[PDB]
Amino acid sequence: ESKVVVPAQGKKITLQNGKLNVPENPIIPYIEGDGIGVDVTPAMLKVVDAAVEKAYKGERKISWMEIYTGEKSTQVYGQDVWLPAETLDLIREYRVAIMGPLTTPVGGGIRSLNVALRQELDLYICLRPVRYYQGTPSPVKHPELTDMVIFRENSEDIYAGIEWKADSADAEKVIKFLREEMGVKKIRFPEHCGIGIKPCSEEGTKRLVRAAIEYAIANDRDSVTLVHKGNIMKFTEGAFKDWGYQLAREEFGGELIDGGPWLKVKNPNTGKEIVIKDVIADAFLQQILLRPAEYDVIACMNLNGDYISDALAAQVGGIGIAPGANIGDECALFEATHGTAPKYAGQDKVNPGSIILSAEMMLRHMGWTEAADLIVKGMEGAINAKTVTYDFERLMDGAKLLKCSEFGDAIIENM
Amino acid sequence: ESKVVVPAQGKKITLQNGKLNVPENPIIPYIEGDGIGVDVTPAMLKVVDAAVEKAYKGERKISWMEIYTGEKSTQVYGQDVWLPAETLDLIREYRVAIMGPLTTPVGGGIRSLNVALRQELDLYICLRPVRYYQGTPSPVKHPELTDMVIFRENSEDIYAGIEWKADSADAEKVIKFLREEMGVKKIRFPEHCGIGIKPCSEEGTKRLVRAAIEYAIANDRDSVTLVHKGNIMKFTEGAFKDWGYQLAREEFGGELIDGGPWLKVKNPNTGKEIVIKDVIADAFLQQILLRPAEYDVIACMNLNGDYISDALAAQVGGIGIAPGANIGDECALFEATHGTAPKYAGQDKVNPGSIILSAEMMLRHMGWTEAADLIVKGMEGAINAKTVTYDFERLMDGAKLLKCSEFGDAIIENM
Ligand SMILES: NC(=O)c1ccc[n+]([C@@H]2O[C@H](COP(=O)([O-])OP(=O)(O)OC[C@H]3O[C@@H](n4cnc5c(N)ncnc54)[C@H](OP(=O)(O)O)[C@@H]3O)[C@@H](O)[C@H]2O)c1
Ligand SMILES: NC(=O)c1ccc[n+]([C@@H]2O[C@H](COP(=O)([O-])OP(=O)(O)OC[C@H]3O[C@@H](n4cnc5c(N)ncnc54)[C@H](OP(=O)(O)O)[C@@H]3O)[C@@H](O)[C@H]2O)c1
Ligand SMILES: NC(=O)c1ccc[n+]([C@@H]2O[C@H](COP(=O)(O)O)[C@@H](O)[C@H]2O)c1
Ligand SMILES: NC(=O)c1ccc[n+]([C@@H]2O[C@H](COP(=O)(O)O)[C@@H](O)[C@H]2O)c1
Ligand SMILES: O=C(O)CCC(=O)C(=O)O
Ligand SMILES: O=C(O)CCC(=O)C(=O)O
Ligand SMILES: [Mg+2]
Ligand SMILES: [Mg+2]
Fold first, then answer.
1. What does the DSSP 8-state code read for residue A227?
2. Which residues on chain A are in Cβ contact (under 8 Å) with B230?
3. How far is the CA of A377 from the centre of ligand 8 (A)?
4. Which of A85, A395, A414, B41 has its CA 20 to 30 A from that of B21?
5. Rounded-to-integer distance, Cα B353 and Cα B231, Å
6. Residue B128: is it exposed, middle or buried by C-beta count within 10 angstroms (0-12/13-18/19+)?
7. Domains of chain B (ranges plus CATH)?
């Protein structure tokens, strides 16, 4: 029995051809989220409604439709229902949705609902833009140098969840097969040993890299960097790099620079030469701090993208100002980079910036660019006014400390 | 037929009990290293010889014995011999050794010789101290806040090298077994799919964490942070965290703080309360930039330690000033954090600081603390004099740019 209420006065977004048809009164499903979701989400709704109202003076409005996942889903549907089938159906049906963060237990418990949503809806792109907002405090000297966009493969890798507990019959079964049937000798302690599988396919790699390159062309970006650990993980991470370059060559007419393997790809529109390069993952983490300007669009696998996202975000104010999207061929689910930060949950304390800027991406995705620009404007105003949440305040002299809801209002005031 | 010359005027280090017996004329095997190894190594020899000479006025001297691995090994022993059995034997025999960086091909070619040495000699500890040297340029505002020590598990993980090429019979064999015999459904594209194995055992975890805690006690450090991705990789990364805390409890009398899972461990000597805590790996990469002072000793797995090392190093000047050691129960091999940086190889351009400070660790390991202190002193002098190599120079106004050999001499001048 459905527990979701479909808004009376809204219309469904449709996908005519490959293009979205967004009506004036679109129904947008949202998930509140666990933990700080309770704080940041109400604030996102308020701010988005304001930007839409100001940009289009009543012509347009979102019909927000709440749907359930996580703790709240259990309180609605009964225990044990963490991810109602309805929810998956509703996001595919309505094409565009947004969520708060969801809690994943460490060491046991349910598998990540985030990963479940991503995998079940085949949202193979995790798109995370990291840019500096003028006036944002930062622990680095030149944050303005960081203007990157992460394309993170979202459907494979060690992130996929294929693993077995130490001392379990399954684990022992796999170990025996590895040792005896594959002649694997490189397992140092075969007893009391957990096992994980890391898959990486050509189709998975190329669909992610294709998207990254297209984004670079559509946005007149300077380069695309393949990030990988292919010297140690030759057949997964190194495969990723090989496939990525191969794709650039076969589908975008990529050409050698010198002896390579770096490529030049000519922007069909602007005619700019887009550089396709690669960097090893550990080195990259120094590179972003020491030579940020040399990097632009980033394409990487599931785990690496996760590490990179947080490290990059830190350069530019931290993950309270880090938006993202999970994007597939049939729908898109926007959400902040950060998680549920349970230790602050309910305190009206955290930065709603990340989820707000995710809605900003959603609006842009919807072609409501005017509303989106109002959000950006409001953000820059509020930050420049040095009226901010705890995470910014503690890196700053003479700032007024605002609560999460308050900072929401601050953003609106500066629209 | 051996190609190594055993020094006429030196004596072998021995391991009486659990303690090293270091003579006055110890024979120390060294490997030059590929790439920039050709630059940095000669410089390390010069600087170490100087520190030993000054500290002990001729009473002590190292009898350097060259041994072979990598490219140079092929030029000496013939093609195809990248890692002569001799070399493994010589390091175990002589107990203490040092190496330049070694090249690992990305996507194919030989497996990492570094990993080979580590695995073959069971050097399960990769120890990387990251501290700020006064006067070092940096892209962060407060580098002095970074004073950490990385304990990185060095014998397991995805780093172990258990993997198969996409479309290979072996890969297809493993995939079929996973799909059909283990009922694995979470592989998105089973065709054209590379596969990797990630093992993590209880014995491996605990021997690494034991070492980390002992180091914290022997050095009066504030805390030990377990870094892991145990919400996504429950049975490897999460197992690591569980075992680590369990060890702290069972072997060091660790006690709850509040409801935990953080522990208090009482320093037997100083009586200081050492905090045992944990942080998720992506979050940690923001944490080190945003709250560096809150971190001290780091214990993590093979891959994570690798990422963390480079990111931390960047905070403090980059990997031209990042020493490390690979340490086992029977011997220790010191080497810089950085690799072969082939693009600069032979140019006398890179910072020899990392390998030099690795020798600094080696000396300390040998109980030649006076010589070690001379190296530290020389380093601080040379850096404070703003006479430096390219990597520091480019982050600095009004510095004199020195070549690698020159900076070596600068260090000696400031002893
Ligand atoms: N996409 C997702 O839904 C997602 C992503 C990551 C994690 N998670 C889940 O979240 C749970 C806790 O993970 P975690 O503690 O490692 O990561 P986290 O919830 O992101 O929190 C880590 C730290 O990041 C900072 N932070 C996070 N959100 C912030 C905000 N809105 N404003 C300001 N600062 C913010 C805080 O740093 P300081 O306390 O240092 O100021 C926080 O303690 C886990 O169960 C995990 O599975 C979910
Ligand atoms: N323990 C080891 O032996 C080890 C460790 C890592 C990698 N490697 C091997 O090294 C090869 C190349 O790896 P990579 O290019 O990704 O890593 P890398 O050789 O460490 O070089 C990456 C970047 O780090 C900086 N850097 C490295 N060493 C430096 C020094 N002595 N002084 C100043 N800056 C330094 C340079 O940065 P900028 O050019 O930006 O100034 C360099 O381009 C690979 O085959 C890999 O297998 C070996
Ligand atoms: N062209 C490539 O494939 C490649 C590979 C590695 C580094 N790089 C960098 O790009 C630059 C290429 O310049 P040149 O080929 O004119 O020397 C170099 O300075 C180097 O730092 C290029
Ligand atoms: N004690 C633990 O196990 C644990 C767990 C997570 C965070 N913390 C941090 O340590 C502090 C513990 O302080 P109290 O238990 O007195 O509130 C908290 O402020 C919190 O930020 C502690
Ligand atoms: O699924 C989770 O709980 C964490 C996911 C995550 O870290 C991310 O992809 O941002
Ligand atoms: O083995 C290699 O080539 C790289 C090893 C590495 O990155 C490290 O452990 O520092
Ligand atoms: Mg994350
Ligand atoms: Mg490394």
1. E
2. 106-107
3. 41
4. B41
5. 38
6. buried
7. 1-415 (3.40.718.10)
